[PDB]
Amino acid sequence: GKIATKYHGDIEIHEKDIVRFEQGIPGFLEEKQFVLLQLETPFIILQSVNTPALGFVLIEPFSYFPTYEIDLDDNTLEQLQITGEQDVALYVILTVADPFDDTTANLQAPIVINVHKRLGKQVILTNTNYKTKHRLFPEKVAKH
């Protein structure tokens, strides 16, 4: 099938490309089908198959946040059929700034995918030190 996208133009996608988010994503419960499209960069677009403008910029968190450590709740593990960490790909969503060096990531709400089962969820971590905005880069502007 063919879809429109935010960053890639019109593309052809296969059924086996689709990751199903059975609960949608927070704010958009009706958005249950996404494809992951590499920004030809360490960046991947979480692209809705139904709504072209709904395309989020993702990174794999450890590339910028090497100590990122989360503990998924039992309900999420069941919903995504996760048996161990080998089943899982993790991503965090960026809030892209201009200039890019001011970009932040939401470490509180990672995207969690069981890759081989093609199932996804955005998990909101409630028990943790992580916040909605963590800079990807150290501060450059001088400060007292």
Side-chain angles (χ1 to χ4, degrees):
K2 176 102 73 193
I3 63 169
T5 69
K6 185 158 167 180
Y7 298 111
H8 291 84
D10 289 3
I11 70 180
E12 174 179 332
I13 61 160
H14 311 117
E15 244 167 86
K16 298 195 64 83
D17 295 325
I18 298 179
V19 181
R20 179 177 191 71
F21 281 69
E22 292 174 350
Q23 294 184 322
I25 57 179
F28 303 94
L29 307 182
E30 70 278 335
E31 296 283 346
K32 299 193 192 299
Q33 288 162 123
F34 287 87
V35 57
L36 279 57
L37 308 171
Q38 291 195 288
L39 259 206
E40 183 170 27
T41 57
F43 307 134
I44 307 89
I45 305 303
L46 182 66
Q47 175 69 59
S48 169
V49 172
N50 297 290
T51 305
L54 206 47
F56 305 89
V57 180
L58 275 47
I59 56 162
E60 179 94 56
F62 309 100
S63 56
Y64 289 89
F65 301 105
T67 60
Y68 191 53
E69 193 185 305
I70 70 177
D71 181 27
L72 297 177
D73 61 281
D74 294 340
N75 189 64
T76 294
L77 296 166
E78 187 182 317
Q79 282 165 333
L80 295 181
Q81 306 195 327
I82 292 161
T83 68
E85 280 306 302
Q86 291 291 342
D87 299 346
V88 175
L90 288 180
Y91 302 97
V92 291
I93 299 175
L94 304 188
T95 300
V96 183
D98 204 9
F100 182 69
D101 197 67
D102 289 345
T103 293
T104 60
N106 186 336
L107 303 186
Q108 192 195 345
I111 298 289
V112 180
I113 295 173
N114 183 327
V115 182
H116 82 278
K117 291 306 220 346
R118 298 305 209 251
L119 299 169
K121 180 175 181 184
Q122 180 166 34
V123 176
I124 301 175
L125 307 169
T126 55
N127 48 281
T128 213
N129 40 340
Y130 295 123
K131 323 286 199 123
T132 71
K133 274 134 82 163
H134 290 251
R135 283 179 58 88
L136 274 63
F137 303 93
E139 285 286 7
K140 288 192 290 283
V141 172
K143 190 158 118 103
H144 290 80

